[PDB]
Every structure is written in C-alpha cells, then in structure tokens.
RNA sequence: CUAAGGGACGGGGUAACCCCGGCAGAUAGCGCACGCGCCCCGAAAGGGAAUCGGGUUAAGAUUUCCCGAGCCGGGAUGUGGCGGUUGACGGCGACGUUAGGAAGUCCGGAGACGCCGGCGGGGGCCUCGGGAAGAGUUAUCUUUUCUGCUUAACGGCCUGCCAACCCUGGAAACGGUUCAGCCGGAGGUAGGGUCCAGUGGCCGGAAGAGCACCGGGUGUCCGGUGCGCCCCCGGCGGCCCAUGAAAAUCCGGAGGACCGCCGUUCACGCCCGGUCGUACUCAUAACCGCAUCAGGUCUC
RNA sequence: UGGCUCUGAGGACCGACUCAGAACUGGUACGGACAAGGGGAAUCCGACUGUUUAAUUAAAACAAAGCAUUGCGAUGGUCCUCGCGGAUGCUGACGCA
RNA sequence: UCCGACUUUGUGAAUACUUAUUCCGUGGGUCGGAAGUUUUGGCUCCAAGGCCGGCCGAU
C-alpha cells in the first residue's frame, strides 16, 4: 500500500500548524523573587483576539523588579477582566479574579485556571474557553494540592504551582450550531491543516485499511490493538468499549 | 410583521432545518444585543470578537463570554470566590 | 520660484553675489522683474509704468539685464 | 474660598502644564473682557535643580536658580492644592512683564535658599 | 478621449502604484503618481487624533524636510498624548502623591 | 527592509557523502579608561530619500538627451538673524509663531493593513448653453453641424469639508439629528473658536510655453447641470467559533547628569552625487504548443 | 405596450428627470431589430450551497453541518526520523488525535 | 513496539541519601543557616545623607 494519511502528519510538511497572525504565547511572567514572597501589580492594556484561540488573552503591563525598564505580559483572560484593571501576581496577593496566586494560598473550592505543574511552568492546566480547575485538598505534609481538571481527573500539583482566580473567558462556545462547511472552513484555516475528511471506507486498500469493497464496509473490528504498527492503528484506538450507553 | 416566528434567523431562508434554525436563534439574538456597562452605565457594550466585549462610549473592553457578556457560570464564580475570600479572613 | 512684493526686497536680492540676470517682461497690465538667483528665481509684479522706468535705472550695474 | 492670594495651584493645560504656581490676584466674578472666574498666577517655569553637599560652591549657585512666569488662567485649568506660598507679591507691556517677572524670580530664589516650601520647588511626576 | 498609460513599469494597480489625471499645459491628459494616504499621530490612552500636526508618510516629517513648529506642539508630552490624557494625568499624579502621604501619617 | 521560507558558526548525529537551529556556546560587539550587552539570503505586484512641464531622433527619453523650473541625500563653511531670567514669545484654552540647550537610560506614534453596504467630497471624463476662430452642408431649411478655446512639479497666501478638540453656559413641556444611524448633567441644543485634507481658490512658475487661426499679428472667454462613468479620499453601518503581516526607516516625548562667549532643528550662501537594467514584441506572426498553429499565457 | 398633441404631480435659490391622466391617429401595428423563463401532475436518489475521474463517466459518487463513538492530564496520546532529533505545539480536554 | 537479563550504577539503614543520569526554568537576579508596594489606566534608573579614595545607608 501507500502511507495513510494518519502517518504523513507527522512529518510536518502540509500538517503544520498556521500561526503566522498569532500575538504570541499566553503564560504567565517568569516566577521571581517578588512573586515567590510578595506582590506584584500589573495593568491590563487590551484584551485581545488570538486566531486560533477560543479564549480572549489579556495584554498586562509590569514594572521591571530591578531594571529600569517596562515588563509586557500576555495571558489567557480569565472572565471578568477588563482593560485599566490591576492584577496582583505572587505569595501576597489577594483571591480575586485575575490575580496570579500559587495553590497554597487559595482555599479549598477555589476556580482557578492556568494551572502550572511544575514550579515555574508559566501555565499548562485549564486554558481553553470557559474551562477551570477545581482545589479540593491541601496537604500540608508533603506540600502537595489536589485539583480538578476539565476532564474529571484528579491531580496532585505542589502546593507552590501558581494559577489565575476565575474561569478562562468565551465559554460556551460550542454550543453554537457551525450550520455551514464554509463556517468549518473558516475555524480550521487558522488552525491545521484538518477540517475536510475523507472516510476510510470511501478509500482505496492502498490508502486505507478501510479501504476497497464492493459496498463501504469496514470488514473488520474498527477497534484496534494500543500496540498496532502506525499505518495500522486506525479507527477506535484501545477501546475499553463501544456502542451508545 | 414581516415574519410570525422566525426574527433574525430569516436570514437563513430555508436552509439547515428548523431546530437548527431556533437552536442558533438565542445566541444569534444575544451575541447582537446591547449590553448595560457597569462602569459608566449605559446600554453600550456591543461583542468585538468571541469573548470580548467593548463599550462604545466610555472605551472599556471587558473579557466575557463566547455569545452573552455574563455567563452564568461566571456570576457563580464570583460568588464562590468572594466567598472564600471573605471567610479566608 | 517665489515672489516678492515690496520693491526695497527686490533691491537687496538683485544686489547679492549669487544673484546672475534680470529678466524684465513686459505684459498687457504690469511690469514683472525676474532675477535669477542660486536656488530660486524671484518675481516682483509692478503695475505702475515710472515705477518700472525707476527700477530700471536704479538696478546694480554689475548685474545682467534683458529684454522678454 | 481656597482661592486667595497666596495659595498655590497646578495647571492642567497650555504650555505650562503640570507646573507650579502661586496665585498673586484672584477675579471671582471675572472681568469685562474674562466673564469666567480667573487669577493671576506666579509659576516656576523652571525649577530649581537637585542640590546636594558633594557639590562644588559654584555649581550649587547655578543649581539653585529658578524662571518665573506670569499667566492668567481660568479657574477650570487650575488643580488647587492644600499647600501655601506667601512672599508678599501685591501685583501689560513686553517690557513691564519682564520686569515684574525678574523680582518675583529674585523673591523665589530667596525663599528656596531658606529650605522652606521643599513641595513648592520640587516639580510634579507625571 | 484620450486614454491613458502608466509612465513606469509598475503595471499592477497596487496601493503604491496609485495614480491621479492632471492636464497639462501641452493640452493632454497624464497620470501623476500619488502618496498614499497616512494616519498622522494617535494618541494611546484615548486613541484619538493628535491636534496640530499633518498627516504625512513617516519619511515627510524629517527635520530637513518639515518645520519645527509643523512637527511638535507646545506642552508637556507635545505630539504624544493629548490635552485630556495630560490633564488626567496631571491630576492623577497630585491626587495619588497626596494619599501617600495621608497613608504614611496614618 | 523584512514575509512564508532557505542556508549556516559551535554543538549533536553520521564510515563518509551528508543530516540537524534552539540545543545556549567566553556569540566574536556597540556608546562616550568608563558604561551597555536579552549571522546571512529571501518580493523589478508587500514596505520604501527625492521631478516636473515643454522640445528633440530614421531608430530614445510613455520622467535618462535639450530648455526652463525644482527636489533629496551627504560634506564642508561663512554672512545675517535668534537665545542667555543660561536654554524664546503669544493664547483662558484647543493651539500658534521661520529659530529658541543637552549625555547614558526609558516611553509613544507613524510605517501598519480584512470583506461587504449606503451616503458625502475632490480630480478627470461625458453632457447643456453663450461668445469668438476656422471648417462642413446649403434646389429648400438650418442665429445651424463639427473641431479646438490649455495650464505641471514646486513655493507663498487664502479657504477650511466630514469627523476630532476647546471656552461660556446649564437642558422635561425633553431636545438635537441621519438615507440609515445615533448623541446629550460623563454637559446637549446654542453662541464663539482650534486643528485636520484637498487631486480646493488666487498669485509666482507662465505665456516667453502649447494649441487654433490670419498674413510677424489675433485669441486662448463666460456660465449650467447630474441616483451619470473611472480613480482617490472622508465618515458611518454591517459581518466573523474568520478579527484580516513584519522589519528597515522617520517623528515625537519623559528625564536633566553636563555646560557660558558659547549655543542655535533658522535664512541665505559653497561642493559633491557610484554600479547594473533601459531598443523592440508582449501576441490569430517577436513567449510555449516541432510552425508565421482558430489552442494556452498576469495586468493598467 | 407605437406615434403625435397636450395635461397634472413631485423642487432649488432657475432647473433635472421620473410617475400618472387625456384627446387624436395608423392596413391591430407597436419589448416591431436586438435582447429575452416554456409551463403543470407525480415517483426514485441526494438535504441544501460546494467537489470530482486534465483527454469517453459531473453522478445517486466525495465533502458538508448535525449525530455518535474512541484515546489522551505532557514521565501523555497520535505521527515522522538511519541516527541525533522532530510535527501536532505561539497547543492543554469548549483541546489535540 | 512490549517484556526480561547485563551495562550505565553509586552510597547507607532495618527503606533512606545525592553526586551519576533524566526533566523543567532563568538576561543562571535575593538559594541555605542565623541575626535583626491593594494605590485612582500617573512617574519610578545612573543615592541623597552620615561618618573616615573607604565604610554605612544596602545585616
Ligand atoms: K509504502
Ligand atoms: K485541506
Ligand atoms: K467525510
Ligand atoms: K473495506
Ligand atoms: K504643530
Ligand atoms: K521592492
Ligand atoms: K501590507
Ligand atoms: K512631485
Ligand atoms: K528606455
Ligand atoms: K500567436
Ligand atoms: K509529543
Ligand atoms: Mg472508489
Ligand atoms: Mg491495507
Ligand atoms: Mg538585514
Ligand atoms: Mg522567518
Ligand atoms: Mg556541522
Ligand atoms: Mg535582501
Ligand atoms: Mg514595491
Ligand atoms: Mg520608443
Ligand atoms: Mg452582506
Ligand atoms: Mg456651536
Ligand atoms: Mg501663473
Ligand atoms: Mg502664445
Ligand atoms: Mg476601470
Ligand atoms: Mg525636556
Ligand atoms: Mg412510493
Ligand atoms: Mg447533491
Ligand atoms: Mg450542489
Ligand atoms: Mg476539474
Ligand atoms: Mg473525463
Ligand atoms: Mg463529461
Ligand atoms: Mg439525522
């Protein structure tokens, strides 16, 4: 046969991301020393549209800690936040939306998002619009915190790990009907390389284990062992089970 | 007058069915509204992009949601978060 | 090129260095004297024919003269 | 009644903006010609300079001298503040203005060399 | 009735390559080429159009090139904010100072 | 100059050819000893220093030659002016005036941006009339039909659209207002002003040119109209789970270390401006389709 | 539905088109050339707009919105690479596959 | 591609350690031990001052 269209993504070349109109990477300010022991105040300048993104990201403006100099940052907006708004980012700074704290400091219930992992990760939990995490416990013993993600699943971040107050802003999004291919085609231009898919059972043998037939049929399970060869692993992947419950 | 049920989804003719049409109906009608700005109280907030809501006269650009500038959700969260920092103190 | 209006300027700019020929041309309402200079070409309309006869005699006699 | 003589305001608009000055004649009502309240007004066009010990003898003569200017403003572009500058002032040609402008400079840069009113001579940051 | 060429070898009508009709002493008609139009300065806290300036290409306002008095205006934070933005922040500096110190004798 | 992207020092891989650019490696230097410190290539449609009119050849110049008139960049140097309350005046103000300090450091703007729909303005063209010049028709009619009656960059003064801004004042019996909107105690209507742009007006250029007539001479003038056509601009509205480049370059600003016979972004004056392309065709015959091929080939 | 002779209405500070009405009149001809839908009653398939076998198949085929399922919390899923390394990813479950 | 053995691979207690190895962050900008700024969409640098180039201010 030939390569499937699953495997040629991988080298990158038509498959690349389209991030030529992006404002940059949304993250928080590089954790410091005023952060790990005090507060800091930025204002926020614009909100902003990000192509590809969901969710709005906030411009916010900080003073340099030890130069003379402007310190420009960019996030995920949480909802709420407005343009000539202080933010408050570090150990001190007060439960409000918009502030950056670390998990330590917010109590049990809190909504945050843009939860990091590691100490210093900048953010990597709960950025797509309208999702959040959760705090359900603190452990004080080994310095540990237990969220929620979006997903349902529990997580034990270190209790240092920062995150913002409130829930990420654009939620929902997808409850809005697309209505229309040229609407799809519209999403996916700025994103991938993606939107129109051919099905497997519309295919050749050689382009697809789908493929061929004298009617469309799969001929066999579309689940598929979690150790197939790529070119292989095609339809369900590892599935514990199937049909509508 | 002009049409008994349809408003401002008539612009869709025929097409994609009609629980689609009343399904797209409210955020096509909430996502156009006017909304009251907390800042300088007026009806002048008006959506910029999905999330992004601006008033018109006063200039403030607010983060909300994808088709409404207050979701439920986000009232919610409010409360759930001046909660806990009231009772944190 | 510019104009100038006051004859006394016109004066001092026939009578710089850089200053090359005058051109006098006669039109049907007025008297226009031009004098070329290094940058610019200068114009000074008199309307009042005496006038003319006046600056024409009293223009610097190291500079160079010509009939339009 | 914060409008007298001798309390000193900030403008807020012209070419003097954000400066310092001291009002020397308040018109409440306002005149003929200015129907709005306005005063007339002794500012620091500018101000005297940061002057330290390590300084030499000369150069903290130099740093010390001040301008004055002499303006009419409306009561709207006027920002009064609580403070107080009395030097006993008690005040039309190119050449009267300039004059009575040098003696308020001479009574201003006295008044700084004596360390009083640090606020006064010290400029805003804006 | 007299048509018209382009006098370059700019042969596509681009935003750059804009023309206009003049008629010349000669009696013809000939196209003359334009500058683009161009934003003068703006001011960033109310995004509203700087007073006192033209509305040049960036390279039209060089010093050789303008005058002085045309390039600048005469307050603090000139070309750059506008009286409003200079007022508010005026006021906000003094207003600001004086609660610094009402904090500190608190 | 940067775009998508390409190459590439060190390092890593590789038997070698060669394959890898974020993996950080004392980054190879910049200002005034002291201070700072986060490669190149890639667009004759993107961004961008500065030119106009008339003439000229067998063949050029749709801006290269000639005539005239400007401009830009760079470099030296005066003469005059301007400032010293060391670093100018005027205006309530918006802001104005050809000048009118300044280092490291820092901040902003322009460049710089989509599609669609009305409305308004400017330029050109078309169109109606009058006057004068020449030509056509003329058995009859036709104060008639036709042609032309022009004004560049650049400089000065005026004007000042639609928005934006300023001062006075204080609004319900609400008013103002668009084709549509919409706007007002967060200050409307009103009154009076500031700025903005023009491909607007007058003057200079410049009638001496060009054109049309008569044999050197005459003329190159006065109006009207518009859901008209093309280009550009302005200002609103709509649309997006779509929000529609970057950099060079230029301008402005915050601060005020430092400095007095020395400063001067002013006017006028002086010198200089490299290399390569430039003819012609651009198509039912100059390109590709074996051709001088009914095909194909991007524009004004 | 032509031609002709009129009439009325709609304005600005003298004008432009439009729209209504009437009389008369021609070998009933008049959107006089040009330009310019044939219509109706049903069955099958595909929702629709889009796309496709350059040079025999334009379709009922493909795509599509909607619906549903699967994997995955980054020490990850999916994929590329001889190797070193790389795409998704300027991404984080309203996401990617 | 999963899975086991050996190698990388060390140390000490009756499972702990950290320096190998691996990963993440930063313009490697306040780590370990002890002693003693919430403000309104504004500005913030190159130290004033004190005491003898030097120290404190700046443990
Ligand atoms: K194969
Ligand atoms: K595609
Ligand atoms: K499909
Ligand atoms: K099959
Ligand atoms: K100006
Ligand atoms: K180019
Ligand atoms: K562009
Ligand atoms: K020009
Ligand atoms: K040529
Ligand atoms: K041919
Ligand atoms: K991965
Ligand atoms: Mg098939
Ligand atoms: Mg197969
Ligand atoms: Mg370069
Ligand atoms: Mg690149
Ligand atoms: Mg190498
Ligand atoms: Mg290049
Ligand atoms: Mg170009
Ligand atoms: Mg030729
Ligand atoms: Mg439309
Ligand atoms: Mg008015
Ligand atoms: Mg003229
Ligand atoms: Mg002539
Ligand atoms: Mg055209
Ligand atoms: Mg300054
Ligand atoms: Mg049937
Ligand atoms: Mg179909
Ligand atoms: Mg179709
Ligand atoms: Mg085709
Ligand atoms: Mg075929
Ligand atoms: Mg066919
Ligand atoms: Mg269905």
């Known amino acids: ?245 | 007058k002009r049409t008994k049920k349809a408003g401002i989804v008539g612009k869709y003719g025929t097409r994609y069915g009609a629980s689609l049409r009343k399904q797209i109906k409210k955020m096509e009608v909430s996502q156009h509204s006017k909304y009251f700005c907390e800042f300088c109280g007026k009806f002048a907030v008006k959506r910029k992009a999905v999330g992004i809501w601006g008033c018109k006269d006063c200039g403030k650009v607010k983060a909300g949601g994808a088709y409404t500038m207050n979701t439920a959700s986000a009232v919610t969260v409010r409360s759930t978060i001046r909660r806990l920092r009231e009772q944190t103190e | 090129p510019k104009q100038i209006h006051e004859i006394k300027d016109f004066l001092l700019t026939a009578r710089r260095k850089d200053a090359r020929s005058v051109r006098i041309k006669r039109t049907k309402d007025a008297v226009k004297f031009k004098v070329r200079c290094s940058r610019y070409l200068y114009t000074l309309c008199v309307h009042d024919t005496d006038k003319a006869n006046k600056l024409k005699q009293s223009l610097p006699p190291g500079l160079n003269v010509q009939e339009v | ?126 | ?106």
């Open chain 1, 1 to 245: 046969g030939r390569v499937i269209r699953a495997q040629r993504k991988g080298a990158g070349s038509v498959f690349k991301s389209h991030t030529h109109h992006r404002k940059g990477p949304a993250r928080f300010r590089s954790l410091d020393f005023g952060e790990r022991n005090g507060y800091l105040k930025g204002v926020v300048t614009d909100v902003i549209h990000d192509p590809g993104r969901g969710a709005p990201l906030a411009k916010v403006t900080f003073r340099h800690p030890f130069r003379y100099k402007h310190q420009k940052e960019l996030f995920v907006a949480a909802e709420g936040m407005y343009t000539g708004q202080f933010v408050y980012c570090g150990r001190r700074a007060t439960l409000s939306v918009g502030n950056v704290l670390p998990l330590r400091s917010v109590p049990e219930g809190g909504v945050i998002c843009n939860v990091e992992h590691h100490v210093g990760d900048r953010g990597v939990f709960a950025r797509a619009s309208g999702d959040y995490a959760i705090v359900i416990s603190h452990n004080p013993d080994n310095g540990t915190s237990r969220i929620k993600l979006p997903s349902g699943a529990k997580k034990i971040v270190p209790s240092s790990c920062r995150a913002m107050i409130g829930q990420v802003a654009g939620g929902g999004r997808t409850e809005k009907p697309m209505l229309k291919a040229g609407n799809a085609y519209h999403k996916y231009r700025v994103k991938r390389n993606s939107w129109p898919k051919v099905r497997g059972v519309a295919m050749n043998p050689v382009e697809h284990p789908h493929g061929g037939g004298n009617h469309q049929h799969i001929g066999h399970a579309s689940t598929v062992r979690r150790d197939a060869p790529p070119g292989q692993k095609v339809g369900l992947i590892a599935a514990r089970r199937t049909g509508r419950l």
């Open chain 4, 1 to 126: 009644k914060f409008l007298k003589p001798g309390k000193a305001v900030i403008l807020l608009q012209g070419r003097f903006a954000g400066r310092k000055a001291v009002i020397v004649r308040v018109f409440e009502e306002g005149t003929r010609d200015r129907p709005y309240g306005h005063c007339l007004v002794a500012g620091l066009a500018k101000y005297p300079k940061k002057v330290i010990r390590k300084d030499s003898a000369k150069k903290t003569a130099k740093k010390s001298r001040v301008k004055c200017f002499l303006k009419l403003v409306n009561f709207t572009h006027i920002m009064p503040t609580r403070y107080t500058l009395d030097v006993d002032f008690k005040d039309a040609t190119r050449d009267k203005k300039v004059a009575s402008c040098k003696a308020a400079k001479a009574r201003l840069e006295e008044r700084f060399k004596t360390g009083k009113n640090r606020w006064f001579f010290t400029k805003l940051r804006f």
């Open chain 5, 1 to 106: 009735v007299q048509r018209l060429t382009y006098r370059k070898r700019h042969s596509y009508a681009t935003k750059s390559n804009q023309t206009r009709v003049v008629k010349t002493p000669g009696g013809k008609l000939v196209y003359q080429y334009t500058k683009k139009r161009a934003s003068g300065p703006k001011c960033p806290v109310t995004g509203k159009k700087i007073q006192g300036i033209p509305h040049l290409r960036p390279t039209e306002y060089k010093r050789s090139r303008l005058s002085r008095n045309r390039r600048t205006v005469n307050r603090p934070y000139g070309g750059v904010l506008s009286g409003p933005a200079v007022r508010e922040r005026i006021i906000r500096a003094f207003l600001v100072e004086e609660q610094k110190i009402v904090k500190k004798v608190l």
